[PDB]
Design a protein around this ligand. Structure first.
Ligand SMILES: O=c1cc(O)n([C@@H]2O[C@H](COP(=O)(O)O)[C@@H](O)[C@H]2O)c(=O)[nH]1
Ligand SMILES: O=c1cc(O)n([C@@H]2O[C@H](COP(=O)(O)O)[C@@H](O)[C@H]2O)c(=O)[nH]1
Lengths: 218, 220
């Protein structure tokens, strides 16, 4: 996957007018948008097609898929029917649940991103201790796309070690949560950035500023 | 003081089109007053499907969204879900205490309820969730969680989770029917059973629900 400026916008605004306006303001800097449940549950799954119509961007559905295999299959089918290019799936619920997602993605020409370790403080309680094994499980399953935490660069580096240089790795927790753009890009192919852009007084300048700070990495 | 689930039976409405979902739910309405609506239906028909269910049926709505994000995103998901009319939302515990607390705080503010999913019922649950489940449940108790989800497919695990949360907590349990869990055995520990495919894929969903209820008649 080829992400413009190695920057993915996490569009977690919850109303259509603001979400479309802010995305429009930063469109020159990105071609990939992560859309999650905050926006989808507020405005409907049709918002995905609207983003494609307006911006032609790729859409990653950040749905943290975390159900039984049968339900995971249904969630992936509904999500890809809505036009998402990719979906984010938790690894914690185990291999069968991930495989269910991989199957639908293959069937519909999409990608699965496996979330291995999360970026927030609570991730330390249960997820972190399982994360390397979850990543090895991804490798065993043939997963090629991964998500890991900007907030713990040593953990992000370990994830990169496990999956190898050929796999694709994206990383949230940049900006608001404390992660540094440049350091994160030592290991991740692309950074995910939400609040630092969409809550900024001037989202375009915020995006431009981040990109300037990583100019030599592009 | 817990929700009063008619016949101790919660329908898992995982059909993905409005017409079928509405037909089947209507067909079993005399047997249930509590419906679990998840992402298969919501991502297919929109959050307004909750509105349509409330209009059509006298049913409480549990939004089975297995919320599993960072605290800030969890808060937004819970707000949107309660705004749409869900009575309760199901949240994963494995992302940790801050993520669960975020959901509890919104539920308290908005006058609604959180269910904490501890151990899951499918085979893959053995890989990572099972080993964390007793602690996830204990964490829930420490956080003041009153409502829980645990697996009918592993009676020994469901029994242990009931012990951890205590007799006063409310416990609901999926994996009944299609996945092999027995209604009666499950109700030894759970307050209510969740049933999806055994009912919604039946040629006669009403007969299927009645049959399940007949099999647990002495437990009502
Ligand atoms: O470990 C993770 C995984 C995520 O998907 N995310 C998601 O990435 C985004 C981060 O946004 P922000 O830059 O505002 O912190 C949010 O949409 C969040 O749900 C995360 O923060 N940490
Ligand atoms: O551990 C769990 C937790 C669940 O919420 N579920 C949910 O409960 C329902 C079970 O439906 P069924 O009776 O068709 O197996 C599904 O909606 C599923 O997503 C589960 O099966 N196992």
């Amino acid at each position: 996957m080829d992400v413009m400026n190695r920057l993915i916008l996490a569009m977690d605004l919850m109303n259509r007018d603001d979400a479309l306006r802010v995305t429009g303001e930063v469109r020159e800097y990105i071609d990939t948008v992560k859309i999650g449940y905050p926006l989808v549950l507020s405005e409907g799954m049709d918002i995905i097609a609207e983003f494609r119509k307006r911006f032609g961007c790729r859409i990653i559905a950040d749905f943290k898929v975390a159900d039984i295999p049968e339900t995971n299959e249904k969630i992936c089918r509904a999500t890809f029917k809505a036009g998402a290019d990719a979906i984010i799936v938790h690894g914690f619920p185990g291999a069968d649940s991930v495989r269910a997602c991989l199957n639908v993605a293959e069937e519909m020409g999409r990608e699965v991103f496996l979330l291995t370790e999360m970026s927030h403080p609570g991730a330390e309680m249960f997820i972190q201790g399982a994360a390397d094994e979850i990543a090895r499980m991804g490798v065993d399953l043939g997963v090629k796309n991964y998500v890991g935490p900007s907030t713990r660069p040593e953990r992000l580096s370990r994830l990169r070690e496990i999956i190898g240089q050929d796999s694709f790795l994206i990383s949230p927790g940049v900006g608001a949560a404390g992660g540094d753009p440049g350091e994160t890009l030592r290991f991740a192919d692309a950074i995910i950035v939400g609040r630092s852009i969409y809550l900024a007084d001037n989202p375009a300048a915020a995006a431009a500023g981040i990109i300037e700070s990583i100019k030599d990495l592009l």
